[PDB]
Design a protein around this ligand. Sequence first.
Ligand SMILES: *Cc1cc2c(cc1C)nc1c(=O)[nH]c(=O)nc-1n2C[C@H](O)[C@H](O)[C@H](O)COP(=O)(O)OP(=O)(O)OC[C@H]1O[C@@H](n2cnc3c(N)ncnc32)[C@H](O)[C@@H]1O
Ligand SMILES: CCCCCCCC/C=C\CCCCCCCC(=O)OC[C@H](COP(=O)(O)OCCN)OC(=O)CCCCCCC/C=C/CCCCCCCC
Ligand SMILES: COC1=C(OC)C(=O)C(CC=C(C)C)=C(C)C1=O
Ligand code: SF4
Ligand code: F3S
Ligand code: FES
Lengths: 144, 593, 131, 237
Amino acid sequence: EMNTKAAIAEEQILNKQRARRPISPHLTIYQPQLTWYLSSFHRISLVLMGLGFYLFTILFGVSGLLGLGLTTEKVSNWYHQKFSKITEWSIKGSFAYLFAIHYGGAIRHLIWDTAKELTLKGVYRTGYALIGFTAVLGTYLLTL
Amino acid sequence: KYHIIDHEYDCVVIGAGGAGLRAAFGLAEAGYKTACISKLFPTRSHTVAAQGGINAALGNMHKDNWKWHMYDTVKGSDWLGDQDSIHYMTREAPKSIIELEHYGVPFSRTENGKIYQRAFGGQTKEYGKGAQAYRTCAVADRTGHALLHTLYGQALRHDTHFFIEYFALDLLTHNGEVVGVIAYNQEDGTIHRFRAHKTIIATGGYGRAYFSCTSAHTCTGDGNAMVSRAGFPLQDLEFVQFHPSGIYGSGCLITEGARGEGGFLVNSEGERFMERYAPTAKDLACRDVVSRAITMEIREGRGVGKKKDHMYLQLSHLPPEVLKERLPGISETAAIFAGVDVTKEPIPIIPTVHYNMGGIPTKWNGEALTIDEETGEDKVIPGLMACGEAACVSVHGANRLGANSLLDLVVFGRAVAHTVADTLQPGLPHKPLPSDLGKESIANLDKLRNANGSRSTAEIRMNMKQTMQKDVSVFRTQSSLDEGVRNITAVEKTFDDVKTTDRSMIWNSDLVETLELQNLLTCASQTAVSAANRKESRGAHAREDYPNRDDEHWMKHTLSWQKDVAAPVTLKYRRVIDHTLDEKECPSVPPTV
Amino acid sequence: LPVLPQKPGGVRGTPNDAYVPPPENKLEGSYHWYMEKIFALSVVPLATTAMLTTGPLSTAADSFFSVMLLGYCYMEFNSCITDYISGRVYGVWHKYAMYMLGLGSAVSLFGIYKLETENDGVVGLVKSLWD
Amino acid sequence: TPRLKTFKVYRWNPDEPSAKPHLQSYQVDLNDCGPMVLDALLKIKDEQDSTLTFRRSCREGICGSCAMNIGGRNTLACICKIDQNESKQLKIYPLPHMFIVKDLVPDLTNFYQQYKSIQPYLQRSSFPKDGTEVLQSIEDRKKLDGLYECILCACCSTSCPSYWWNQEQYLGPAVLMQAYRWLIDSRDQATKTRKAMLNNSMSLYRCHTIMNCTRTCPKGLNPGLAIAEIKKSLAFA
Ligand SMILES: *Cc1cc2c(cc1C)nc1c(=O)[nH]c(=O)nc-1n2C[C@H](O)[C@H](O)[C@H](O)COP(=O)(O)OP(=O)(O)OC[C@H]1O[C@@H](n2cnc3c(N)ncnc32)[C@H](O)[C@@H]1O
Ligand SMILES: CCCCCCCC/C=C\CCCCCCCC(=O)OC[C@H](COP(=O)(O)OCCN)OC(=O)CCCCCCC/C=C/CCCCCCCC
Ligand SMILES: COC1=C(OC)C(=O)C(CC=C(C)C)=C(C)C1=O
Ligand code: SF4
Ligand code: F3S
Ligand code: FES
């Protein structure tokens, strides 16, 4: 029955050619813009910070099931050796800026879901008010 | 050699423009199996680039009678329009734009919830003796844009079998009647034989035969060459329209509504064109008066511009409220290809080719026409119809009014769907035909694919384009037109040694551009010979050696035959129709000056 | 990770074979958007009033903080599963990686119980690693 | 005296599919050229290598066929102007993360199947009796400004990272603005059916607000604010 044996005879010639097609490049050619860099940092910072929140609560959670008796001073003193004093400031310094760019980013992402400041002038003026706010509060936690 | 896939449908439609889409869900709604074969995606055609309106005698700015709208169509056509097709388009104009808004076209609205109408040029109320009337019924400057995006969405509601990105090569014929088309798929390179009962051609006009035009790149003549290659005539091919306003160099079009609400043609001296050399005492006339006004201004000595071929259109006099609400898309398309804004300084203007009123000779009800070679009387072609800009119903005649060609697609694309349902019964076995139907269209695809010659296909396309800009122009005599038929014949004899460098079949965009050139030489070599056999001057066809309209000898359209390229063209004539559908509803108008 | 057989070229069929949408499942639709915007409207005030307080934070001022930080970090990792370990391309290993945020994170709520009772909250552990 | 600018165009050929895709270098004279990029791609195909295939129809920027990735950003070639500096080269690419067909021609087939699934037509169930049009006020006509004039070029969809991975399920920014165009149409009284095919896991809630959408739109529209109002209307029901 034509228009039915004419459709299966079309998919056979086409699916053979659709499997030899390549994918055009997506990363490593696109222009680095402010709308994506400052919203890819927002997920990298929460993943690295959230992994530490999970790694320190399972370690205090497997000690309750399997009785080992871990306190804060039992694990704070262990972290204070095994690393150099330069290396500790590399962890204390990087985790402060990743907290500052996510604390300001979560206030940026709350005005955005109430349909406010989503034009192209409101995206670029609250991205400079997030980069500058990051350097203020990021250094503020290294002194304190 | 190849492999050919066979389909079976009740009706096939070539083209997915504003006319082939309206004819597609008119038949799929009535209970048929339609197939809309297209070369581009449907909302990528040429009717997306219209910044005008669609005329309707709705009468929501003032009182309006339809019969007033009939009088401006036939008077502005120099009495060559068939008044039984002027009567049908104009009477069914209010019924067909209210129905167009029930599909979901967002129109500009007025202070009570009614459709907003503005003024174009050529249309006046009280039977041509009165003030200018408002019958345009438009979105702001996306009237053609919002027309495709609504007609394509309504064609997804009913089952219309789109075959997107197919190049339709020829027609299939069997003893004087047609049975369907043979198309070439671009995505994988298979030839398709569509068998049909009625086939409809809505493939748009040809503008790319000329050097600088306002048409698209894909706006070649592809249905007018499929018809004449089968032995059927083409009608009124000598009447091409030259727009008064177009961007210098490239050919982009600023809107007809730029001179609609405030617009001044400014020469080198800076005076409005009302009198003293070219025009009549009214500004914004039809596009044969004001386009013959400009091309004779730069020739006599009033040379504005840089190389003394230019014009200015003033727009600083308007308020800035008009330049954002009523027309925002003209503010941007003049500051890119020219590089000048629309609020302080005038933009460049050059007359270029706009519209083509020639095509398939067609009745008022959509059926195509031919003539009997012994009696000279009309005779329909069985199984073939036409609509749109590739069809000459002669609702425009020799000069097309503003905003009347978007009403051609909606009305006469709808009348096509009514004269199939009153003529065919859904579903009826197809005739057994030979196994080699469409074999001369495969060997013509297999000849241009393996081309080995001297001249490339973009070198013959420049010899054709510059010849028809020199001879067949706004001012022509019978000493340059006799040369123009002699130079367009010397070009067509060099198509036999074309060169093609791409031997693939998946997206061969070099085989298509040399198949769009074979299609364009057939419609170009008939525009040249049939313009050199009209010894009068009416409409957009002006002759400097015969400058008087001849309403006693030359009240007839022409009919041009040409089987292939480098073949002799013969001409015959048919009488215009000067009586309406019902003489009791409206009377037929008599020809005046 | 085992990959299911995919569609040959991204698509299947003609352009006029429309996409068939999944049924309305507003528990993981409109109701999932609430729990992200509730857990984010109750962390940024409680992290603001945890940097202006010099000492540790109260017991009841940390058990609200330690629970709203769990769901805010759980809805974040739920978005990195659906985007990357998806069901079109990995199949049953979308559910197996979604159960490791189950009984691999419900015992991270018992770890809160070892911090609100025997120690001084989670704000006392991160202020004493000296950040 | 000529001035030569060097172009670099992404090339593939489906007749010999075993070879990898690569960049080919062409030398375009800038003196006898046009200002735009499509005036320099059409100049190559006439006076040079003529197997270079691409899509073009109107040269104006109103249809949407010439959408490619010129210089990093997604734009239309009819309008993207060539920088008149011969020392700097230009790189042209197809739309990112798309299965290309021949050279610069991406398979936009999944983009047309998703546009059909949002039902882009009016679904009114009652019309006036006198035979005139259905009423709509002027202030309810300004709701559609900025939405009804999208040209379906898919430069916004193939700039979204969350559409690069999940494009077989997530509708993308170009299609979801064309569902918001019918949602706030005041004469479209069937609106509960439209806000029920978006209420699943991956049709609308894969947007994260990485607004490349609004950034790269050549017509100046805003498909990132339009997604944030479908979520705002799916909640307060
Ligand atoms: C060019 C133009 C026209 C225009 C205008 C402004 C410009 C720049 N402004 C107008 C205005 O203000 N008012 C008005 O009334 N008209 C105006 N126009 C004219 C109007 O746009 C045309 O009359 C109209 O566009 C004609 O539409 P039609 O449907 O007749 O033709 P199309 O839009 O070109 O569509 C053709 C379709 O057919 C397909 N095709 C072509 N060749 C083939 C082959 N060989 N095989 C298969 N399909 C084919 C095309 O791809 C398209 O789909
Ligand atoms: C289970 C615990 C492990 C949590 C994960 C491991 C560490 C990662 C925590 C976040 C990354 C680094 C942020 C930590 C910086 C904040 C702590 C700090 O800066 O120390 C000083 C600073 C001030 O000390 P004062 O005594 O008041 O006065 C200064 C001395 N005169 O301490 C504070 O009180 C800052 C308040 C703590 C802020 C963060 C607390 C919660 C962090 C847990 C993980 C967060 C996950 C997601 C949070 C982001 C939400 C937007
Ligand atoms: C949230 O926004 C983004 C993503 O979401 C789909 C990504 O996966 C990626 C790719 C992966 C990472 C983490 C950069 C990009 C580029 C991005 O910005
Ligand atoms: S929203 Fe803009 S970029 Fe996206 S398809 Fe429409 S016009 Fe193109
Ligand atoms: S770029 Fe994509 S991720 Fe969302 S904000 Fe726009 S649809
Ligand atoms: S061709 Fe219309 S935008 Fe490039």
